[PDB]
């Protein structure tokens, strides 16, 4: 499985995931590629905020689905 993680600057990355990987793991996989600690991340999919504890299959993230990596909060 492949998902895309896009950012506000256009930088897009590809992650090799499984439909049963939790949001915490996909965050850690972003940490592998980018060196961003998951505590410094927020992931958005279709406007909805992805929560720790739930899986990709929950929010229904299919192959070639693009996630938005937010790097600025309050």
């Amino acid at each position: 499985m492949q998902i895309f993680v896009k950012t506000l600057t256009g930088k897009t990355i590809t992650l090799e995931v499984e439909p049963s990987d939790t949001i915490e793991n996909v965050k850690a996989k972003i940490q592998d590629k980018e060196g961003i600690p998951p505590d410094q991340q927020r992931l958005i999919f279709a406007g909805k905020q992805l929560e720790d504890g739930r899986t990709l299959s929950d929010y229904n993230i299919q192959k070639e689905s693009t996630l938005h990596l937010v790097l600025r909060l309050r």
Binding site: D39, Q40, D52, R74
Partner: protein, 150 residues
């Protein structure tokens, strides 16, 4: 039929109350708490009494107690429903935190509004551009809604 941590936490709140804060359990539900927090001095809420409700979810021990203001308050970190951001930054809720930790947090929050981290955007809009008039409004709400309410 209820864990011991909740019982001693309850008792230690009646036996050793937090100054400015009253918390006693509901008559029908040992997990529901009716809270009164006095308006801290040297704050626009001085002389006020603020009613809150604190609920312990069934996963309260591993979860974070849900709190809500009942009294109407002009504060940038309380939405129009009375909800408070139980913020934990770069970490999650751990059982090392207690009810008293939450109660002290609200009390401290009443003394240090954080407009750059808003929950009432129109209120936080005023707290940044016209802080002296936001404080003036908060003092007015304290007299209207937070006096003789208990």
């Amino acid at each position: 039929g209820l864990p011991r941590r909740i019982i001693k936490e309850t008792q230690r709140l009646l036996a050793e109350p937090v100054p400015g804060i009253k918390a006693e359990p509901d008559e029908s539900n040992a997990r529901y708490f009716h809270v009164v927090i006095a308006g801290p001095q040297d704050s626009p809420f001085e002389g006020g009494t603020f009613k809150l409700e604190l609920f312990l979810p069934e996963e309260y021990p591993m979860a974070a107690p849900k709190v809500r203001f009942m009294t109407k308050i002009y504060h940038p970190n309380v939405d129009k429903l009375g909800r408070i951001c139980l913020d934990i930054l770069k970490d999650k809720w751990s059982p090392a935190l207690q009810i008293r930790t939450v109660l002290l947090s609200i009390q401290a929050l009443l003394s240090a509004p954080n407009p750059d981290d808003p929950l009432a955007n129109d209120v936080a809009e005023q707290w940044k551009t016209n802080e002296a008039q936001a404080i003036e409004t908060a003092r007015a709400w304290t007299r209207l809604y937070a006096m003789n309410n208990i």
